[PDB]
């Protein structure tokens, strides 16, 4: 039979806050030349 089942959320705001925090700080790859290699060995790969 049917009884009252509410949803009084207390976890979703925390999830939204964490998602916003992780969205405000984007992270992307950064190619860096190896030791002893040509100084701009990563320009083409970075462009691609």
């Amino acid at each position: 039979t049917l009884q009252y089942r509410g949803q009084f959320d207390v976890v979703r705001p925390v999830v939204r806050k964490l998602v916003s925090e992780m969205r405000q700080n984007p992270i992307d790859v950064l190619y860096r030349p190896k030791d002893g290699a040509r100084p701009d060995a990563a320009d083409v790969l970075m462009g691609m």
């Binding site: 039979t1 049917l2 009884q3 009252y4 089942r5 509410g6 949803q7």
Partner: protein, 152 residues
């Protein structure tokens, strides 16, 4: 049960009252039968307030059948003692008698036990009010929102 008719109920009531029983050598006068049967019918009609009172299965005699005496009472086996104790208590003043303390206590206990089961049955909880939601827990699958199904 050996008690199977209004006459048997009346005889048991008179035997409790000590008016007409073999233990007192007394026999039932014919005119002490009809008056007690009328008293029993009045009591049962008063109890069964057109179905809104005590339910016992008692069979109410009609006009077409001439003899009210000798008809099956129709009570269940668990109501006979209460019915005839109450009958004795009610018809005691006819003979300017007074039903003794044990008879009165048994009558009270029997009436309470008679209505116990119907009280349990009628202890029902009303449905949900007309301004409640069902909550998202119930409405997340079918968008019911504002309906409690009258299941039980």
């Amino acid at each position: 049960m050996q008690i199977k008719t209004k006459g048997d109920l009346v005889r048991a009531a008179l035997r409790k009252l000590g008016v007409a029983s073999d233990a007192t050598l007394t026999d039932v006068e014919p005119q002490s039968m009809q008056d007690a049967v009328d008293d029993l019918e009045a009591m049962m009609a008063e109890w069964y307030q057109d179905g809104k009172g005590i339910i016992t299965g008692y069979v109410f005699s009609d006009d077409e059948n001439p003899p009210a005496e000798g008809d099956d009472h129709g009570l269940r086996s668990s109501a006979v003692s209460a019915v005839f104790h109450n009958l004795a208590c009610r018809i005691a003043p006819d003979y300017a008698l007074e039903a003794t303390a044990k008879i009165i206590a048994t009558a009270k206990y029997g009436k309470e036990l008679l209505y116990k089961q119907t009280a349990i049955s009628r202890a029902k909880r009303a449905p949900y009010p007309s301004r409640m939601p069902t909550g998202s827990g119930n409405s997340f699958a079918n968008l019911n929102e504002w309906h409690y199904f009258p299941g039980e």
